[PDB]
Amino acid sequence: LTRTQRRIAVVEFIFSLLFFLPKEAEVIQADFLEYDTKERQLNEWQKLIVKAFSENIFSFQKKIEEQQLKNQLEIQTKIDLLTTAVVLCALSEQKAHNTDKPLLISEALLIMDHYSQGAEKKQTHALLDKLL
């Protein structure tokens, strides 16, 4: 599997959880194990993202909540749950693996295309991730 496919697997997982939150951190981590299949071949790289997600979901969800709002501009001189799941994965991944900002954003937009969301305009906030 490609790193992109592995990212998609985390996104879909997170997505399925956002309908029924909150769950305890170790519960989500154990739910991720039951989520594994022949095709997913879930590895430690993905499990570390889900671990960061499980332990920081309250803060990530807050940071998101407030960045959207803080986007209230004049000049320059309703986020959905799939788009949220994509953004939380990027936050989770930068936390677990310290992936650089440019790679995370391109990848995120690539996943949005995969789900034919075409709401790419809500970048992975150039505001929410750190450029190293």
**Which residues of this chain interact with Cl ion, rule CB under 5 A?**
5, 8-9, 12
CA distance 68 to 70: 5
> Considering CB distances under 5 to 8 angstroms, the limit depending on partner class, which of Na ion, Cl ion, none binds residue 117?
none
> Considering CB distances under 5 to 8 angstroms, the limit depending on partner class, which of Na ion, Cl ion, none binds residue 104?
none
Write the CB contacts of 12 (distance below 8 Å, at least 6 apart in sequence).
Answer: 85
CA distance 125 to 101: 10
Among the listed ranges 18-26, 44-52, 97-105, 111-119, the one in contact with Na ion (CB under 5 A) is 44-52
Which one, 7 or 122, has the nearer CB to Cl ion? 7
Rule CB under 5 A: is residue 10 a binding residue for Na ion?
Answer: no
- Residue from 24, 23, 29 nearest 10 by CA: 29
